[PDB]
Amino acid sequence: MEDRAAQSLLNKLIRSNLVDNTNQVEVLQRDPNSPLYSVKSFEELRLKPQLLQGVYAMGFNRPSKIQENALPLMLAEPPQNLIAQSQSGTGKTAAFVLAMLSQVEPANKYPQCLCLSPTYELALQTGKVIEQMGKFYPELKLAYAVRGNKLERGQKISEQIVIGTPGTVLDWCSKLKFIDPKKIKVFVLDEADVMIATQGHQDQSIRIQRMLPRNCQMLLFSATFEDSVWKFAQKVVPDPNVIKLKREEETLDTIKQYYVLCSSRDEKFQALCNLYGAITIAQAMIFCHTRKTASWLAAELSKEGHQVALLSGEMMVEQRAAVIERFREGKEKVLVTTNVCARGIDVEQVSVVINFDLPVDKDGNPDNETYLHRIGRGKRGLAVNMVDSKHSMNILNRIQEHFNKKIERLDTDDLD
């Protein structure tokens, strides 16, 4: 099961800047003999003038934690292959786009750089960065090799850069002969953790990678390294330098955890209204299990005079992005959401979490990951868990068992 694409898109639509990470980058140089090399500025990388111009113009002062290690590896001569894993928002897309723009020679009117995205909508996000960093390349044009593109059989395309989805790209490189694969200098496999979702996407990617010149630079980027992601990368990127950055560790040290005992949904709703009655609820998210519950809760709250924003799956991703952004600006004080709609999403400016229903997995057990990632976000936070059965009480006790910190009982009416 992979809702992966949607989540990856939403995270991009709302991302405004680099996520802060304090762990150190792990580099496994292809040759264990050769030393490690890092940079601390773009100038140190002797970039093509107009490319450097584009980099500053889009607001980048210096390379990010991950770029410090990737850029030099990618700009090495002769071109080395790279597998880079790091959580989203750490500068992976800016990196390989910089890589592509370095190798691309606008003089030559054929595809020189090829990037595979898992979906057209994600392709457009990469496409956005390219148009922006390479805005001082006059003759640089972009092509989308996607199922939607209605290109009629004919001559080869003249765009120096192609982005697209495995299925369409393979055809363009073979059957429909829109691209000469042997002329590709740089091949990027983006969002590997998302592309493994379809068995089809894997096989197609591999079969494309095999048509490339053997000295083509292969770059594969990924947020996570599940065993499946790893064994796939090994099949796509031969002789790889490997960059790994450990995901930031969420911390419940600065957070107050409560739970309220209830007997029905109607009581959970009253506990919550009481909570509004006591403290001013703002910058808060309320998590429900089903879309049915979320829309009901939001309707009931509105009726009680509380304005809330709903975040459920019937909304297009762009709509969820607009809501989330209003929530960040403080235009919205409270966000009601289903679990799935918020899973993995890096919503910012959240001081208060209300688990209207407790987070569980497909089976029925405590979803410790999701809990920690919600609550964790030395800044003070509030977390309130609504328990409404002996069963959901068990879940809470098992959550309080996993972590070794107590969830203090909170009496509905007594909230001093």
Ligand SMILES: Nc1ncnc2c1ncn2[C@@H]1O[C@H](COP(=O)(O)OP(=O)(O)O)[C@@H](O)[C@H]1O
């Ligand atoms: N060197 C840099 N300096 C400042 N900001 C950057 C730099 N590289 C990327 N960013 C910004 O950080 C955010 C994450 O970049 P991105 O490459 O999209 O992350 P990823 O591809 O790893 O998900 C984006 O908003 C991007 O504009």
